[PDB]
Amino acid sequence: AKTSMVAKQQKKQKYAVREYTRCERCGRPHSVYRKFKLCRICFRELAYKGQIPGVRKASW
Amino acid sequence: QVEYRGTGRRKNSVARVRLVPGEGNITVNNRDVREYLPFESLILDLNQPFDVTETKGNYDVLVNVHGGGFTGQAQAIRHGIARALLEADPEYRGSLKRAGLLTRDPRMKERKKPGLKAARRSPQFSKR
Amino acid sequence: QKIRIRLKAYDHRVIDQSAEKIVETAKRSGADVSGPIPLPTEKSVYTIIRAVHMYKDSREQFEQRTHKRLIDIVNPTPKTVDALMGLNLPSGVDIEIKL
Amino acid sequence: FEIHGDNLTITDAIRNYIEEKIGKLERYFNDVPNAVAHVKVKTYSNSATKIEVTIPLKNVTLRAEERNDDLYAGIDLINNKLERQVRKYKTRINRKSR
Amino acid sequence: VPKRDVLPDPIHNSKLVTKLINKIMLDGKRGTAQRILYSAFDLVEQRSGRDALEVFEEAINNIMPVLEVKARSNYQVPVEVRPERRTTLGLRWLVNYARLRGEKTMEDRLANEILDAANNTGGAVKKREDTHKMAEANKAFAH
Amino acid sequence: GQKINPIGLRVGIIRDWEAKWYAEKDFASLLHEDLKIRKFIDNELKEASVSHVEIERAANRINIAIHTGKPGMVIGKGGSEIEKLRNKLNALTDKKVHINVIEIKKVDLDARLVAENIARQLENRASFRRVQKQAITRAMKLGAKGIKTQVSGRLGGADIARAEQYSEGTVPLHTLRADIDYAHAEADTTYGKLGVKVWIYRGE
Amino acid sequence: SIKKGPFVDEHLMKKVEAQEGSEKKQVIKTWSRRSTIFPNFIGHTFAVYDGRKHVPVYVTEDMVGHKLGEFAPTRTFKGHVA
RNA sequence: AGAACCUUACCAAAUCUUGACAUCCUUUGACAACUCUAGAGAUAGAGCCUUCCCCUUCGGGGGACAAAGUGACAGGUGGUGCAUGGUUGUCGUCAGCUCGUGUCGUGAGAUGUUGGGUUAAGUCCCGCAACGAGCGCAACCCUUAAGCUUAGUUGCCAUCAUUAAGUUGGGCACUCUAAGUUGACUGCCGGUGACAAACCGGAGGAAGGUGGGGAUGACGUCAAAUCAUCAUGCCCCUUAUGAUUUGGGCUACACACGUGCUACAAUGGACAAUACAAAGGGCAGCGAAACCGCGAGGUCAAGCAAAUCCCAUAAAGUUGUUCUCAGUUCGGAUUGUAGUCUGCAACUCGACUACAUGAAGCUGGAAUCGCUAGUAAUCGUAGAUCAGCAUGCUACGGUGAAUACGU
């Protein structure tokens, strides 16, 4: 399961790249951003929070 | 001398119509209308403002212009002209507005949304 | 000889009224201030789906806003310096004092 | 039809049975564009034998389901439904004058 | 509900060329359509040389119908055409037959078609015929 | 659709951001810095029952101000707690703080306070509905223009999921000038999870 | 391709260093995906761990339309009936 | 919203067990870098330098530690989306959906929410044992079309002088630029209309009939979906149903389904010259020019956290030349050869460049799908996901029509 993988993406490496930038709060690796390091959905939750500015919304 | 002037707006194409008494002649961007705008043999329609206003004519022209393609960019010409003709004489507004060309077309492109792909086609349904 | 600055916050009221704060404290002890020369104030985009497992086509969008303000002042002197670093608040602005 | 089985492994025995049955509908009319079958063991824990079936038709289609003790009873009970769900349709019968 | 008019033709001061370049205007490419059509006004005005409107107007009064039909149980009614639909369909079979010669040129197939059609021949005068053989054959049970 | 708390639809117009600092692209550091505080407040949730806190970050300092209904608790008698909170915080923030509690007025009208309130009377073996009866009762009392209050899960410690809500007071929701304070809660005892979704309307 | 150029894991080559001067061996077990043939490996055997079990491949003369990383693709019969 | 390892959940082997990792209690401690040996690594065997740094009155307290013990425990991508929360599609952006009071009625129940008109709409008005209120539509908000003001750099050049070049001087006048203004509200009029509700028409106006779109999606159905987002009721495991390493695999193919992409050609293919956008990325990333090269790329290095500099040059098109209707210069799969970039590593399984080779295929049968105007259709552009990598997704523009009788 992901519980040891938590350490995997935190462990050291033989070399540069066998790594990934998963989410912090969630552990979903896929569908993430290098801007905030958050999965697809925590961003949604905390965009509704308006925690960060943030904007949101619907001007496009 | 004197010279009239106006602004032009459509289709992401902007023009600062500079309209002066003269022969009736164009060098857009210091370059003629004809070879510049492909192809194009449509410039009667660009002179139809003269076909209806102070007809025949003529007044020479200057204009700086950028943005979009020839369609809007040739079509961004007129409303600065016709507006400069309101500024010339509002009398012909009755001859303009009954014929358009001082009404800037408010229409433009749309946005995207889920459904669109490479060709602007929304999806099929489940046949079989 | 001039002074210049750059501002970046994500509310259009507070940032320009704050410009009036520092500008007021500036032409207090100076003058020759360029008014709030606007800037294009571009944006961003961030798209996320309303889902967890499936249903990709039905989604949602977000963005970011990014205001910039160009303000300057001429014939400098140490008084307008203190007007610069005197009153920037609220601190959502990102002042960059320069010359 | 994606004859898929949730928590039950479709054998050839089951496929043979199924397709065999729908062959009987060549009475009307087959015309075989496609057909599907959803089968599942949903624990109650008396626990099932669920059958849901889909028929795409000419200019229309007709879904059909049913639950029962076992797979064969579910296929036989769901039968005599997707026949009367089909029969009749037409005729319809001519006019106008005037 | 209106039909989004085209102003004049800027070539010879007609109009229906404009209505017609747009029917050659495939892919939204106008210049190639305009190109090949006006070229056809070179070719047809050359061969048996004459005005545009002799061969054109005549030919599009040799194929341009007067009665059409519509279905409604199913009973096909003969109907009087609205002149926009008349001219519309004339040009429809014009281009939509123009490809159907099966030839090489941009224009010969066109100028062959309008020349032939000015002479009351070819598949466009034909569809006028057969169409008006559905008209007055089908007067009886639906008019 | 189907629905969203309007706060996401109301924010950017009619309310502050829930956390604040200067606008630089070092967000992964600073956002996940904020969160380390946002976690720790739950220790005080069991002691404070605060609504929320929005942080400012001055040019070299931090300001937070906690929206509580338990001032003397969190202040203590003479600040015997706030200062070791500065240092136990500053220990973890790796940077200092200037806390300044922002006490709640009007007073126990708020959504979050009432939300976990009724969740907790429910957690103490209560027929659920009466809690909402007294809730709305003291709600229109304190002066409010629109309320409902929803609940989900295995109610009464029994069989499969249910729901309920008592709507009273006209609640403009599909508007865009409502300025209303949505909330949520989560608390079970033995059977699953029974959150709630309270609503209010006070002013515009 | 490679950045000018051919390579080896620098333990396998360090092994056949000890294998190759003396009376050679007909036996090497390995894992050998990040290493490939070249004329020092000649005269020896290898057995690359396919993913389940190594299997012998003796280095022949012009094994140059071929390499070390694979000799019996682990799709393994086939994967397909035909 | 990126499977060579990683990811990966799956498989092999090499492996460990208070464990991969976390807290507590006990023993200490600043926490270990560079190599050697073996190992495939994991890792060990060692050498070795981690070495109480804040406080200490002699000790201790303490941020943080070593390996061990310590039993709880840890952990479970083990199961249950019909034990659930949360979150989301759905019919449906349809026009409806309820209640307090009262009446009626044995009673369930109806009334309001019905009849007439009217609107896109429970929109309004009238009449009415009904009256009032709620949610819902509109409205409120964002964007867009016009103008006014505010301010002029990195933006513009109108008068100019000037540079190859708005390059320099100067001016913000213009366009541009971001915030408050005025504006369109059947509002003004005419008509039709139970005069009301309204509807038809006209004037102006930039915009006349909720200007266009965006957001917002009622009660609720689908025992809809998700225990693998997160959390979690219950069950189960616990020297393994847990956890570590090197390799494989998640991509195999007689085949079928869906979805897209590319060809079946002269409205065109090959080649030379030439005009036009929008948006947006950039810190050690964007790599200007120059230089090398058949090109992928390689060298160099100016500038630049951007109205600047760079990314980056638009394609369709326009001008011509040729090809002259072939399975053709259509066609562009196939396979090999020789190379570039990245990666420790491009064989199962990265892309791309140069050379050759040239499959099927001449508009697709029955059947079947979308779309009402800048729409369709077509040609481009950037962005994320990123070491590498999009016929996909999102966003941007360019060009750009046919039809709409009537129901």
Swiss-Prot record, chain A:
Zn(2+) binds at C23, C26, C39, C42. Its cofactor is Zn(2+). Keywords: Metal-binding, Ribonucleoprotein, Ribosomal protein, RNA-binding, rRNA-binding, Zinc. InterPro entries: Ribosomal_uS14 (IPR001209), Ribosomal_uS14_bact (IPR023053), Ribosomal_uS14_CS (IPR018271), Ribosomal_uS14_sf (IPR043140). It comes from the Bacteria. GO terms for molecular function: rRNA binding; structural constituent of ribosome; zinc ion binding. The keyword rRNA-binding applies. Binds 16S rRNA, required for the assembly of 30S particles and may also be responsible for determining the conformation of the 16S rRNA at the A site. NCBIfam families: PRK08061.1 (NF005974). This is Small ribosomal subunit protein uS14B. It comes from Staphylococcus aureus (strain NCTC 8325 / PS 47). The lineage of its organism: Bacteria, Bacillati, Bacillota, Bacilli, Bacillales.
From Swiss-Prot, chain C:
One of its GO terms (cellular component) is ribosome. Keywords: Ribonucleoprotein, Ribosomal protein. GO terms for biological process: translation. GO terms for molecular function: structural constituent of ribosome; tRNA binding. It comes from the Bacteria. Pfam families: Ribosomal_S10. The keyword Ribonucleoprotein applies. InterPro entries: Ribosomal_uS10, Ribosomal_uS10_CS, Ribosomal_uS10_dom, Ribosomal_uS10_dom_sf. PANTHER family: 30S RIBOSOMAL PROTEIN S10 FAMILY MEMBER. Part of the 30S ribosomal subunit. Belongs to the universal ribosomal protein uS10 family. Involved in the binding of tRNA to the ribosomes. This is Small ribosomal subunit protein uS10. It comes from Staphylococcus aureus (strain Mu3 / ATCC 700698). The lineage of its organism: Bacteria, Bacillati, Bacillota, Bacilli, Bacillales. The gene is rpsJ.
From Swiss-Prot, chain F:
Keywords: Ribonucleoprotein, Ribosomal protein, RNA-binding, rRNA-binding. Pfam families: KH_2, Ribosomal_S3_C. One of its GO terms (molecular function) is mRNA binding. Residues 37-105 form the KH type-2 domain. GO terms for cellular component: cytosolic small ribosomal subunit. The keyword Oxidoreductase does not apply. It comes from the Bacteria. One of its GO terms (biological process) is translation. InterPro entries: KH_dom, KH_dom-like_a/b, KH_dom_type_2, KH_sf_prok-type, Ribosomal_S3_C_sf, Ribosomal_uS3_bac-typ, Ribosomal_uS3_C, Ribosomal_uS3_CS. Binds the lower part of the 30S subunit head. Binds mRNA in the 70S ribosome, positioning it for translation. Belongs to the universal ribosomal protein uS3 family. Part of the 30S ribosomal subunit. Forms a tight complex with proteins S10 and S14. This is Small ribosomal subunit protein uS3.
Swiss-Prot record, chain G:
GO terms for cellular component: cytoplasm; small ribosomal subunit. One of its GO terms (biological process) is translation. It holds the Pfam family Ribosomal_S19. InterPro entries: Ribosomal_uS19, Ribosomal_uS19_bac-type, Ribosomal_uS19_CS, Ribosomal_uS19_SF. It comes from the Bacteria. One of its GO terms (molecular function) is structural constituent of ribosome. Keywords: Ribonucleoprotein, Ribosomal protein, RNA-binding, rRNA-binding. The keyword Ribosomal protein applies. PANTHER family: RIBOSOMAL PROTEIN S19P FAMILY MEMBER, SMALL RIBOSOMAL SUBUNIT PROTEIN US19M. Belongs to the universal ribosomal protein uS19 family. Protein S19 forms a complex with S13 that binds strongly to the 16S ribosomal RNA. This is Small ribosomal subunit protein uS19. It comes from Staphylococcus aureus (strain NCTC 8325 / PS 47).
